[PDB]
Amino acid sequence: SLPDLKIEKLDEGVYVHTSFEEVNGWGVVPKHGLVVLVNAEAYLIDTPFTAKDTEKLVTWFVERGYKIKGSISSHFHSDSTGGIEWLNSRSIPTYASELTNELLKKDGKVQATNSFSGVNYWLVKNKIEVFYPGPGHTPDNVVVWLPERKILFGGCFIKPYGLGNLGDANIEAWPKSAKLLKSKYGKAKLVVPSHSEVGDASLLKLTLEQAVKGLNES
Ligand SMILES: O=C(O)c1cccc(CP(=O)(O)O)n1
Ligand SMILES: [Zn+2]
Numbered sequence: 001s002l003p004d005l006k007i008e009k010l011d012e013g014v015y016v017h018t019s020f021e022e023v024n025g026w027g028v029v030p031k032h033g034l035v036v037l038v039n040a041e042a043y044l045i046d047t048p049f050t051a052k053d054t055e056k057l058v059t060w061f062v063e064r065g066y067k068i069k070g071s072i073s074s075h076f077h078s079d080s081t082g083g084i085e086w087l088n089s090r091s092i093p094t095y096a097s098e099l100t101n102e103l104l105k106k107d108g109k110v111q112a113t114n115s116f117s118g119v120n121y122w123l124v125k126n127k128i129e130v131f132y133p134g135p136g137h138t139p140d141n142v143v144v145w146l147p148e149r150k151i152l153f154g155g156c157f158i159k160p161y162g163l164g165n166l167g168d169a170n171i172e173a174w175p176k177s178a179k180l181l182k183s184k185y186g187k188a189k190l191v192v193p194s195h196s197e198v199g200d201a202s203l204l205k206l207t208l209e210q211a212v213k214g215l216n217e218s
């Protein structure tokens, strides 16, 4: 009996959604994503683990007057993409990078209906930016930046107290990718990881230290 989906306000127009799954070798894993409001329109930053929780999440915001304009998934693992099939069935636009869609396709999973390619991409120009720091947790992991609020969604790339599941990780590249992320977003007020609590910009530093440490054990 996994805990319920939770939705809590992080800042003006920015909510954190947390869903839960039992994953072998890890136990009950919490997963944070965002919902970002731009006027009367809501954007999902990562989907919950499941269709059920994705539907709950969507229902919560629609019942409060927000139209769901789209979702973006930060990498191909199901804790970011589990909801895409359900969103597609409701004609809600889903986005992922070209690489992410390729990895979903390779794994026989449903793909996002929209893809983007390149280091930077505006999901919503001047409001929601996507940035690729390079391989780390996965080859495809991206982060989402909210310039108006100085909030960085780091997804499963931000790992301040341990790197987590290394199955698809690029441990060689992660310290350099972390370095780039830190340089770009040292100015962040808040950094939102997938699996640990919201913090400030120090989470960027800690991730870099954890990545360097993980690489050291060769
Ligand atoms: O390191 C991680 O991001 C991590 C670890 C355990 C579990 C999960 C969730 P999934 O099994 O969907 O990758 N993620
Ligand atoms: Zn992952």
Ligand SMILES: [Zn+2]
Pocket (backbone or CB within 6 Å): 077, 079, 156, 194, 195
């Ligand atoms: Zn994860």
